[PDB]
C-alpha cells in the first residue's frame, strides 16, 4: 500500500545486483520451468518446410537475490525491469526468424514472489523449420517440433523442465489450420552434447494430418473429369478424325498442364509424391485413348468390322480399368 | 483512420487507429498551473504506462515519422491522456461457406499483458461512443454493417485479465464477383448451346465447342480456388461453377448421343437437337433461380 516502502524494497533487491551472474553462480544449476500457451499456428509451408507459431512463453526460476519480506503479495512490475534482472538465455534451435511482439509495449511480464521466484512471460511469433516427408502427399502426416535450448549455459549451470509435466503446454485446441488437423502433441526433455558441452533441451512436437478435401476439388476431380472426357471419343464416328484427334490432344495436353502446375506449388524434391502417381496414371489412360483412335484410323478402311469392335471394347474396358486403377490407388494411400 | 486490407488467404485485416488511454496517477498531480500540460512525447519513457496489447494481432507498429506518433497530456489531478498511432494486422478467422455472398465478424481483442484485474481494470471511455471513425472505413469489397464494443474478464492459469473487444460486421459486395467469375461462367454456358443449332454432320465444329467450353469451365474453377485459402469445404461460388460444369459437359454428351444415332435414326437425332435448344436454357434458368434465392 505504501509505494515509498515498495520502492525501498525493490531498490534494495537491485542494489549491487550483478546481471552478469546467473542465480547460484558457482553452485548447483538454476532450474528453469517452462510453460507454453499456444495462440495460433498461422501457416504451414511445404515450399519453405516451415510453420509459424504464436505463443505465450513462460519461464519460472528462483533467484534468492530477489527474495523480499514484509509484503504478503506477488509483485507485478513494469516490463522494463526485465532489463535489470538476470534472465535465462533460452532460444529456439530450429527457428528461422522470431520476434517478441512490441505494441503497445514489449509483450513481456515480470512477476516476483516473496521467496525470489520470478515468472517471466513473453509473447513470441516464431517461424520454425519442419522438414517434411512428401512421399504420400497429400495423404501425408508430418511431425513438426519446437526445440528449446540454453544458448550458452551448460547443464552444470542450468536445467530445464516442463512445469506441470504433460499439462505444461496449453491451447493446442486453439490451432485452426484449414488444411491440417492436430492428431497429437508430445513434450520431451533431454540433454544434448556439442563440442562446447552438454545443454538442456525441451522439445514440443505436433502430429499434423493433412485434410484431403481441398485436393479432391483442386486436382483429383479435374483429372478424373478430363479422363472421362477422353472416353467421349469412343462414341464418336471413326470418320470424324478432326473431332477424335481434337479430344485426344486436348485431354493429353490438359493432363500435362495439371502435372506441371501442381509441382510449382511444392519444393523441388527429386522423388514422386502420391498425387504425381495419380496424375501419371491419368496421363497413361488419356494417352492410350488417343492411341486407340490412331489404331482405329489406321485399320478402318481395310478392316471396318475390327475397327468397330475396338471402339465397342474401349467403351467398357477404359471405364472398368480406370475404376480398378482408382480402387488400388485409394486403398494403398487411405 | 482506415481498414487498408482484408485477406481471405491470410485470414486477417489491417487497421490504422489512434489508440487513446486515460488513467489517474496521483504522483503526477500538480498545483498552481490552471492548464493541461502537453509534454514532448519523449516524457512517456519516464512514466508508468499500461501494458496494453492486442491479443489477436499478428504484427503491429507505432508510426515513427517525424517523431514517434505518441502524445502525453497531463491534467492537474494526475490524469494522463496517452495517445498512439498504430497500424495492426489482426487475425480474423473467416467462414467462407457462403463466399462470396458471406458476412464476416472481425474483432480487435485488447488486454493487459501482465497485470491481472487485481491491478488494472479497462473500460470503454464514453461507453458506446468510445470508438469513432467507423464511417471513414472505405473497403471497395466490403460494407461495415455494424460495430460493437464489449468488456469482460478472461481467465488464464496466471489469473483473470481485463479485456475489451471491438467487433465489425463486414458484408461482402457481390459486384466484383458478377464481373470476374459469374458472368464469364454464364457466357461459356450460353456458348455451349450454340452447338445445338449447328448441323449434326459438323462433327469437328460441335466437338470443338464442347471441348473448349468444358476445359474453359475447368480453368475458371482451378483459377478461383488459387485466390482463397486451402479450405476442405465447398464455397457458394464453387457450387455455381460445378453446376455450370455439369451443363457444359451434358451439352457435349448430347452431341456424342446425336453423333452415335444420326446415321441409323436421323429423325430421333434431329428431335434431340430441337429439344436441347429449349431444355438447356430453361433448366439453366431454373438452376440460377434456385441458386440466387438460396444465397441472396
Amino acid at each position, epitope marked *: 500500500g505504501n509505494m515509498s516502502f515498495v520502492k525501498e524494497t525493490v531498490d534494495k533487491l537491485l542494489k549491487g545486483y550483478d546481471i552478469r551472474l546467473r542465480p547460484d553462480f558457482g553452485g548447483p544449476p538454476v532450474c528453469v520451468g517452462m510453460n507454453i500457451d499456444i495462440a495460433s499456428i498461422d501457416m504451414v509451408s511445404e515450399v519453405n518446410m516451415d510453420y509459424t507459431l504464436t505463443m505465450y512463453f513462460q519461464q519460472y526460476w528462483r533467484d534468492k537475490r530477489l527474495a523480499y519480506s514484509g509484503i504478503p503479495l506477488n509483485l507485478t512490475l513494469d516490463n522494463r525491469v526485465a532489463d535489470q534482472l538476470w534472465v535465462p538465455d533460452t532460444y529456439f534451435l530450429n527457428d528461422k526468424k522470431s520476434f517478441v511482439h512490441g505494441v503497445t509495449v514489449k509483450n513481456r511480464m515480470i512477476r516476483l514472489h516473496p521467496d525470489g521466484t520470478v515468472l517471466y512471460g513473453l509473447r513470441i511469433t516464431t517461424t520454425a523449420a519442419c522438414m517434411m516427408d512428401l512421399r504420400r502427399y497429400p495423404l501425408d502426416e508430418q511431425n513438426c517440433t519446437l526445440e528449446i535450448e540454453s544458448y550458452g549455459y551448460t547443464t552444470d549451470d542450468i536445467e530445464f523442465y516442463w512445469r506441470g509435466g504433460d499439462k505444461a503446454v496449453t491451447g493446442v485446441e486453439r490451432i*485452426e489450420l484449414p488444411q491440417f488437423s492436430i492428431v497429437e502433441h508430445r513434450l520431451v526433455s533431454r540433454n544434448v552434447v556439442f563440442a562446447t558441452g552438454a545443454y538442456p533441451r525441451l522439445s514440443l512436437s505436433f502430429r499434423l494430418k493433412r485434410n484431403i478435401g481441398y485436393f479432391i476439388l483442386q486436382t483429383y476431380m479435374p483429372s478424373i473429369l478430363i479422363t472421362i472426357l477422353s472416353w467421349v471419343s469412343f462414341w464418336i464416328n471413326y470418320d470424324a478424325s478432326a473431332a477424335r484427334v481434337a479430344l485426344g490432344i486436348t485431354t493429353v495436353l490438359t493432363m500435362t498442364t495439371i502435372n506441371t502446375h501442381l509441382r510449382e506449388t511444392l519444393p523441388k524434391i527429386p522423388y514422386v509424391t502420391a498425387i504425381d502417381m495419380y496424375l501419371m496414371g491419368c496421363f497413361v489412360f488419356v494417352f492410350l485413348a488417343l492411341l486407340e483412335y490412331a489404331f482405329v484410323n489406321y485399320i478402318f478402311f481395310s478392316q471396318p468390322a475390327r475397327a468397330a469392335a475396338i471402339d465397342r471394347w474401349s467403351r467398357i474396358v477404359f471405364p472398368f480399368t480406370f475404376s480398378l486403377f482408382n480402387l488400388v490407388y485409394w486403398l494403398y494411400y487411405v | 483512420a482506415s481498414i487498408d486490407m482484408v485477406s481471405e488467404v491470410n485470414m486477417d485485416y489491417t487497421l490504422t487507429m489512434y489508440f487513446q488511454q486515460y488513467w489517474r496517477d496521483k504522483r503526477l498531480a500538480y498545483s498552481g498551473i490552471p492548464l493541461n500540460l502537453t509534454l514532448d512525447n519523449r516524457v512517456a519513457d519516464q512514466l508508468w504506462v499500461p501494458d496494453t496489447y492486442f491479443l489477436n494481432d499478428k504484427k503491429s507498429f507505432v508510426h515513427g515519422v517525424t517523431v514517434k506518433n505518441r502524445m502525453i497530456r497531463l491534467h492537474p489531478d494526475g490524469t494522463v491522456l496517452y495517445g498512439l498511432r498504430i497500424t495492426t494486422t489482426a487475425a480474423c478467422m473467416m467462414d467462407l461457406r457462403r463466399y462470396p455472398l458471406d458476412e464476416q465478424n472481425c474483432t480487435l481483442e485488447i488486454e493487459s499483458y501482465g497485470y491481472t484485474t487485481d491491478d488494472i481494470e479497462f473500460y470503454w471511455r464514453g461507453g458506446d461512443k468510445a470508438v469513432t471513425g467507423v464511417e471513414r472505413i472505405e473497403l471497395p469489397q466490403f460494407s461495415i454493417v455494424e460495430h460493437r464494443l464489449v468488456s469482460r474478464n478472461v*481467465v488464464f492459469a496466471t489469473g483473470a485479465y481485463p479485456r475489451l473487444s471491438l467487433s465489425f460486421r463486414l458484408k461482402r459486395n457481390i459486384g466484383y464477383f458478377i464481373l470476374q467469375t459469374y458472368m464469364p461462367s454464364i457466357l461459356i454456358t450460353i456458348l455451349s448451346w450454340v452447338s445445338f443449332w449447328i448441323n449434326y454432320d459438323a462433327s469437328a465444329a460441335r466437338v470443338a465447342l464442347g471441348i473448349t467450353t468444358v476445359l474453359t469451365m475447368t480453368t475458371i474453377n482451378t483459377h478461383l480456388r488459387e485466390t482463397l485459402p486451402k479450405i476442405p469445404y465447398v464455397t457458394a461460388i464453387d457450387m455455381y461453377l460445378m453446376g455450370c460444369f455439369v451443363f457444359v459437359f451434358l451439352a457435349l454428351l448430347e452431341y456424342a448421343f446425336v453423333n452415335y444415332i444420326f446415321f441409323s435414326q436421323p429423325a430421333r437425332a434431329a428431335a434431340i437437337d430441337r429439344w436441347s435448344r429449349i431444355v438447356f436454357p430453361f433448366t439453366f434458368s431454373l438452376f440460377n433461380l434456385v441458386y440466387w434465392l438460396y444465397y441472396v
Partner: nanobody
Amino acid sequence: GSLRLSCAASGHTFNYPIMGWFRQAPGKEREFVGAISWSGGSTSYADSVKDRFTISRDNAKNTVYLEMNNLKPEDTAVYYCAAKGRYSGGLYYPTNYDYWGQGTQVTV
C-alpha cells in the same frame, strides 16, 4: 454401467469453436469435465474422468456427446454443456464460457 449424455447446438457456432462439459455437485464449485473443438475434434479431459469418460461430436447434427463409462458415486452432479469464444481464455475456467445448457441432474 455405460451412459451417453448428448449436447445439441444451433446458431452462430463458428464464433464459438469449443464446447465444454462442466458438473456442479451440491455445495461445491462448477467443475471442468472436458471440452471438444467442433472443427478437428481436439479433445481435453479433467484428471478425475481421464480414461473413463469420452467426448466427441458430429458437425452434421451440430451435436456433442459425453459418453460416461465406468461410473462412480463421486460422479453425482448437475452436468452442464457450454460454448467458448475463440479468444475467451483457458478451457478449464467456466467464467470464460458464454452459452450454458439447462443442466441434467445425474445420480448413481
